[PDB]
């Protein structure tokens, strides 16, 4: 693991500043976010300055998806067995309540729970909400 680069970010910043919220933002986001951890996905999103209303629309979708995820994935009984990693909650997938090595484990466990791909799908559904409002 290497945290995303200022180089990739600059690109996403240039994308959002020019194209606002045209359909083109979505395929771009997907390209720049290849293999991202949740932490990296949030660093990309945090780089957006302004567009507060649209950023809140994204957050609402992320919160809704995360709660759906919890609903469909009941917590297993603790205590967790030695060696085993706990199952991710919605907030873990979105990066608020998890660490980076946890994200890495899930992504690299057997098989993977690909918490980056999951969170990215939620983000994408939020970007679709924004694109349909603005364009």
């Amino acid at each position: 693991h290497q945290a995303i680069s200022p180089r990739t970010l600059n690109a996403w910043v240039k994308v959002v500043e020019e194209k606002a919220f045209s359909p083109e933002v979505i395929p771009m986001f997907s390209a720049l976010s290849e293999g991202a951890t949740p932490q990296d996905l949030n660093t990309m999103l945090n780089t957006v300055g302004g567009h507060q209303a649209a950023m809140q629309m994204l957050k609402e979708t992320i919160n809704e998806e995360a709660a759906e995820w919890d609903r469909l994935h009941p917590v297993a009984m603790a205590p967790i067995a030695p060696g085993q990693m706990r199952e991710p909650r919605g907030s873990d997938i979105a990066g608020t309540t998890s660490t980076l090595q946890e994200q890495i484990g899930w992504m690299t466990h057997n098989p993977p729970i690909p918490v980056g791909e999951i969170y990215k799908r939620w983000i994408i559904l939020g970007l679709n909400k924004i694109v349909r409002m603005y364009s």
Partner: protein
């Protein structure tokens, strides 16, 4: 005495293994102690008699008390709702500690576990409420039926259980 003593007679695929008894620390965690004591005597008309240790992890613990679904997804306390973590005064100090299993903070029902090792990292996450008095060797035997993910190789049941004194 203030602290009650409970016994479980354990069977393996119907065959008697032996008896394990516990001291319940009612003097430190009276609400958690009373739940397990009442489930052990059956006095509320439901409880542990006949239920199974559904998850046994060698070198870690033995877990049971789901007498409603028998697989971890059930359990129910005597209080008509899951109940808060009473306190975390007592620690997970080695084999024979009796502690509550849970699905997060303040979600105690009827599931419990018996430590077969020191598990200090559980301190502050599971409420310790008792300890094995007699029968630790029976606990150690039960551990041989577990596996790394907890699946048991034979049906480990609480054939009978109640209060001593």
């Amino acid at each position: 005495m203030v602290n009650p003593t409970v016994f479980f007679d354990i069977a393996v695929d119907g065959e008697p293994l032996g008896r394990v008894s516990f001291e319940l620390f009612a003097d430190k965690v009276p609400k958690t102690a009373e739940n397990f004591r009442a489930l052990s005597t059956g006095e509320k008309g439901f409880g542990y008699k006949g239920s199974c240790f559904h998850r046994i992890i060698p070198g870690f613990m033995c877990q049971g008390g789901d007498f409603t679904r028998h697989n971890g997804t059930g359990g129910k306390s005597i209080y008509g709702e899951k109940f808060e973590d009473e306190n975390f005064i007592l620690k997970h100090t080695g084999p024979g500690i009796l502690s509550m299993a849970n699905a997060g903070p303040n979600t105690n029902g009827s599931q419990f576990f018996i430590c077969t090792a020191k598990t200090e990292w559980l301190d502050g996450k599971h409420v310790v409420f008792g300890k094995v008095k007699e029968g630790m060797n029976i606990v150690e035997a039960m551990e041989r039926f577990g596996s790394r993910n907890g699946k048991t190789s034979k049906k480990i049941t609480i054939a009978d259980c109640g209060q001593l004194e």
